[PDB]
Ligand binder design. Sequence first.
Ligand SMILES: *[C@@H]1O[C@H](CO)[C@@H](O[C@@H]2O[C@H](CO)[C@@H](O)[C@H](O)[C@H]2NC(C)=O)[C@H](O)[C@H]1NC(C)=O
Ligand SMILES: *[C@@H]1O[C@H](CO)[C@@H](O[C@@H]2O[C@H](CO)[C@@H](O)[C@H](O)[C@H]2NC(C)=O)[C@H](O)[C@H]1NC(C)=O
Ligand SMILES: *[C@@H]1O[C@H](CO)[C@@H](O[C@@H]2O[C@H](CO)[C@@H](O)[C@H](O)[C@H]2NC(C)=O)[C@H](O)[C@H]1NC(C)=O
Ligand SMILES: *[C@@H]1O[C@H](CO)[C@@H](O[C@@H]2O[C@H](CO)[C@@H](O)[C@H](O)[C@H]2NC(C)=O)[C@H](O)[C@H]1NC(C)=O
Ligand SMILES: *[C@@H]1O[C@H](CO)[C@@H](O[C@@H]2O[C@H](CO)[C@@H](O)[C@H](O)[C@H]2NC(C)=O)[C@H](O)[C@H]1NC(C)=O
Ligand SMILES: *[C@@H]1O[C@H](CO)[C@@H](O)[C@H](O)[C@H]1NC(C)=O
Ligand SMILES: *[C@@H]1O[C@H](CO)[C@@H](O)[C@H](O)[C@H]1NC(C)=O
Ligand SMILES: *[C@@H]1O[C@H](CO)[C@@H](O)[C@H](O)[C@H]1NC(C)=O
Ligand SMILES: *[C@@H]1O[C@H](CO)[C@@H](O)[C@H](O)[C@H]1NC(C)=O
Ligand SMILES: *[C@@H]1O[C@H](CO)[C@@H](O)[C@H](O)[C@H]1NC(C)=O
Ligand SMILES: *[C@@H]1O[C@H](CO)[C@@H](O)[C@H](O)[C@H]1NC(C)=O
Lengths: 216, 323, 46, 115
Amino acid sequence: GKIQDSLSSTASALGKLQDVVNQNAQALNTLVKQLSSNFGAISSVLNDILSRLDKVEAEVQIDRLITGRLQSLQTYVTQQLIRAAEIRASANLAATKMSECVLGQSKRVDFCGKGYHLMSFPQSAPHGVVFLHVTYVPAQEKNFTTAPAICHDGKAHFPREGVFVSNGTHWFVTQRNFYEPQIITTDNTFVSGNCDVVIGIVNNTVYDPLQPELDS
Amino acid sequence: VDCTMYICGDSTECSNLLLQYGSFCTQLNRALTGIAVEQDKNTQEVFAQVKQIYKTPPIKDFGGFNFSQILPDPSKPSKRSFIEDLLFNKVTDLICAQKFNGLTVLPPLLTDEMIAQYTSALLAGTITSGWTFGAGAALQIPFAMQMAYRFNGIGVTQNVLYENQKLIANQFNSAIGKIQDSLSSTASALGKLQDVVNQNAQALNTLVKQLSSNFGAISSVLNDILSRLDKVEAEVQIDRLITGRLQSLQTYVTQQLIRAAEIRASANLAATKMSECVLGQSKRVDFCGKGYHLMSFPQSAPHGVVFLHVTYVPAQEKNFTTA
Amino acid sequence: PLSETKCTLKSFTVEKGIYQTSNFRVQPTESIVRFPNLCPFGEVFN
Amino acid sequence: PCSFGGVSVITPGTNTSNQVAVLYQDVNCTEVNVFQTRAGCLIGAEHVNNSYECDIPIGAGICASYQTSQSIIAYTMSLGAENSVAYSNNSIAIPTNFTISVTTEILPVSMTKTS
Ligand SMILES: *[C@@H]1O[C@H](CO)[C@@H](O[C@@H]2O[C@H](CO)[C@@H](O)[C@H](O)[C@H]2NC(C)=O)[C@H](O)[C@H]1NC(C)=O
Ligand SMILES: *[C@@H]1O[C@H](CO)[C@@H](O[C@@H]2O[C@H](CO)[C@@H](O)[C@H](O)[C@H]2NC(C)=O)[C@H](O)[C@H]1NC(C)=O
Ligand SMILES: *[C@@H]1O[C@H](CO)[C@@H](O[C@@H]2O[C@H](CO)[C@@H](O)[C@H](O)[C@H]2NC(C)=O)[C@H](O)[C@H]1NC(C)=O
Ligand SMILES: *[C@@H]1O[C@H](CO)[C@@H](O[C@@H]2O[C@H](CO)[C@@H](O)[C@H](O)[C@H]2NC(C)=O)[C@H](O)[C@H]1NC(C)=O
Ligand SMILES: *[C@@H]1O[C@H](CO)[C@@H](O[C@@H]2O[C@H](CO)[C@@H](O)[C@H](O)[C@H]2NC(C)=O)[C@H](O)[C@H]1NC(C)=O
Ligand SMILES: *[C@@H]1O[C@H](CO)[C@@H](O)[C@H](O)[C@H]1NC(C)=O
Ligand SMILES: *[C@@H]1O[C@H](CO)[C@@H](O)[C@H](O)[C@H]1NC(C)=O
Ligand SMILES: *[C@@H]1O[C@H](CO)[C@@H](O)[C@H](O)[C@H]1NC(C)=O
Ligand SMILES: *[C@@H]1O[C@H](CO)[C@@H](O)[C@H](O)[C@H]1NC(C)=O
Ligand SMILES: *[C@@H]1O[C@H](CO)[C@@H](O)[C@H](O)[C@H]1NC(C)=O
Ligand SMILES: *[C@@H]1O[C@H](CO)[C@@H](O)[C@H](O)[C@H]1NC(C)=O
C-alpha cells in the first residue's frame, strides 16, 4: 500500500527516469537552437546568405554555418554515444537484477536493496523499469550471553547450524537470524576435538534424544 | 571551467563573438556540472551505505586479532588508520595557473576526515556486529564467533577455527604487518589511483597549454592581436582563436565525460564490493581476490578506496585414495 | 544574485538545492606602468 | 590574478521561501550576514554549531537547510547518527522478530530512439 503513496505523494522518486527523458529533450532543444546561431556567418537563415550575396562569396559564409552546424551535430552525437553507454551500463544492471533478483533469489548483499532479499516484482515505467524488492529485515533484539562451544563430557559440542545462547540460565542453540530457542541435543551439535583448546567454551549438559527412549 | 573567461580573457571584443556560438559556452558547464554533480554521488554510494556511525568499544579483545593498524588512530588530529596515512603519503603552483584561467577545482563534498568516519564505521561495524548491519540493526556478536560463521560461508566447518584460533590470529596479524611493509616501499600498488590523478592533471595541463597556441591566428595573446590591428580584422583572427580554444575545450570536455564514465563503472564496482564483500561474505569466486573470502576491511585513499581482503587459502596437501 | 539564477533555470519555480549563477570577477583599480643609460648632455652642453 | 569563482545561489524551494543565501566560491571574504567557509565566502546564512543530517550539499561537508522566524542556516555536515555498539566477547544479539519491507528500485532501460 505505502508503495502507492511513496510514488503518489512525491514526484522525485522517478528522477532517474525523469532525468534521462529531460537530458534527451534537453540536447535536442540545444541542437535545434544551434540552427539559429550565426557561427560567424552573416545570418542563421541559410537562404538569406544565398539571397543577399552573390554565391562566390556566399560559399565562404555557408562554410561557417556548415562547419558550425556540422560540428554541432558531432557534439550532439558524441553526447548521445556517451549517454547511451551509460544507459547500456544501466540496462545490464537491470538485466542482471531481472535475471538474478526477479527470476532467482539473490545472495548478493544489498544488490537487490537493503535487507535479506526474498523476491522482486518488476514493473515497467517509461523508458525504464521499476523493481519492488520484498526484503526481510529483522527487528527486535535481546542481549544474550553466548558461548562458541559447550563441554559435555570433555568433548566439545558445536552448533550444527546457528549458535548457542543463553538468557542467563539455560543454554539454547538457535538459528542465527531469528530467535527460536531450542533445547540442546546431539542432533543440534556435532562433536569435535575436546575442551582444553576452544576459547570460552562453557559447561552444560547436552541432552540425549536416545537415552530417555531406552529405559523401557 | 568558465568558457567565457577561458576562451576570451576578460575582454568583451572576444566575449561578443562567443555569443554567436550560442550554447557552446553554457552546455560545457552543463556537461562539467553533470560530471561534478555525480562525482559526489559516487563517493555517496561507495562510502556511505551505513545508516549510523558506529565506533568500536573502548577495549579490544577480538581473540588475538590486532586491528590497531586499521582502526582510526585516536592521536592523529584526523583520525585515520595507521595504514591510511601510508596511502596519503604515496599519492600526491599547478592549481594556481589553472585557478587563473577559469579552471576551478571544486571541493569534494566529503572531506577526508568525513570519509575516515565512514571507513571507520563500516570497519567498526564489521568487527563487532558481524555483517548484519547491512541488513538492518547491527547485532553485537563475539568476533571470534563471527569467524565461525564466515568459515561456514567457505565450507570449512567451524570446529577448525575454535581449535586453530591462535594459529589463525598470528597468520592474520602477521599478514597485516606485511601490508604495511609493502606500502612503505611500494609506489606502484597505488598506480591505479596515481594514474587517475595524473591523467586529469595531464589533460588539465594540455588544456592550459592550448592557451599558448596560435591556432593559425597571428598570436596566442588575445589583446596583442587587438592592439596590433584595427578590430574589423581582429573579428576575423579572434575566430581562429575561439575556433581553436572552443574546440580544445570540447576535446577536453568530451575526454572528461568518457573518463568520468570509466571512474563511474569503477565506482559501481567499489559499491558492489563495499556492499557484497565488506557488508556480506561473497560467494562469488575471485571477486574479492584469490582464495575463499572471509571479510574485507575498506580503507580510504585519495580519490579512491582500498580494501584489505582477508581470504582463506589452503596450503599443505596429501595424496589420498578416494571413492 | 537570486534573480539571475531563475534566468538560468528559465523557471519561476526553483527547486530546493544549490544552483550556479554566473561567475564574478574582481576588477582592477588602476594601471601600473613601470620602466627601469644617460645621454651626455652634461658632456655636450657643459 | 584577482580571485574569481562561481556564484552559487543556495535556496530552499521557491515554494517555501523567497530567501536565498549566496555562496561565493573560493574567495576570502573581502571582495564582496557573512560567514567564511572552507568552500568559499557564504553570504546570507547564519552559522550553526549543532550539526544535522545533510540537506543541501555545498562543499567541504557544509550542508545548508532552511529551518530556524526561520532563516537559511549553514553547518558542518553531520554524518548519520552516532552509535556505539555495546560489545563484549560473550555478548550476542539475536533478533526475535522481523519486518518485511518493499523497496522500490528504479532504473533506466532504454532512451528515446532518435535519428
Ligand atoms: C530463560 O529461558 C528459559 C526457557 O524458558 C527459562 O526456563 C524456564 O523458565 C520458566 C519461567 O517461568 C519456568 O517456568 C520454567 O520452569 C523454566 N524451565 C526449566 C526447564 O526450568 C529460564 O527461566 C529463562 N531465564 C531467564 C533469566 O529469562
Ligand atoms: C567446567 O566444568 C569443569 C568440571 O566439570 C571444570 O573443570 C575444573 O576446572 C578447575 C579449574 O582448573 C579444576 O581445578 C578442576 O579440577 C576441574 N574439574 C575436574 C573434575 O577436574 C571447568 O573449569 C569448568 N569450566 C569453566 C570455564 O569454568
Ligand atoms: C597491536 O599492535 C601494536 C603495534 O602493531 C602494538 O603496539 C605496540 O606494543 C608494543 C608492546 O608490546 C610497544 O612496544 C610498541 O611501541 C607498540 N607500537 C605501537 C605502534 O603502538 C599493540 O600492543 C598490539 N596489541 C595487540 C592487542 O595485539
Ligand atoms: C599449519 O601450518 C602452520 C604454519 O603456517 C603451522 O604452525 C607452525 O607450527 C610450527 C611447528 O611445527 C611452529 O614452529 C610455528 O611457529 C607455527 N607457525 C605459526 C604462525 O604459529 C601449524 O603447525 C600447521 N598445522 C598443521 C596441522 O599442519
Ligand atoms: C513481531 O512484530 C510484529 C510487528 O512488528 C507484531 O505484530 C503485532 O502484534 C500485536 C500483538 O501484540 C498486534 O496487536 C499487532 O496488530 C501486530 N501488528 C501487525 C502489523 O500485525 C508481532 O506480534 C511480533 N511478534 C512477536 C512474537 O512479538
Ligand atoms: C544490550 O545491552 C546494551 C548495553 O549498553 C544496550 O545498549 C542494549 O540496548 C541492550 N539490548 C537491549 C535489547 O536492551
Ligand atoms: C571476555 O573478556 C573479559 C574481559 O572483560 C575476560 O575477563 C573474559 O575472560 C573473556 N572471556 C571470553 C570467553 O573471551
Ligand atoms: C602426489 O603424487 C604426485 C605424483 O607425481 C607427487 O608429485 C606429489 O608430490 C604427491 N603429493 C605430495 C603432497 O607429495
Ligand atoms: C509546496 O507548496 C505546496 C502548496 O503550494 C505544499 O502543498 C507543499 O507541501 C510544499 N512543499 C514543501 C516541501 O513544503
Ligand atoms: C583571509 O584574509 C585574512 C586577512 O585579511 C586572513 O586572516 C585569512 O587567513 C584569509 N583567509 C583566506 C582563506 O585567505
Ligand atoms: C559555537 O560554540 C562556540 C562556543 O563553544 C561559540 O563561540 C560559537 O559562536 C558557536 N557558533 C555557532 C554557529 O553556534
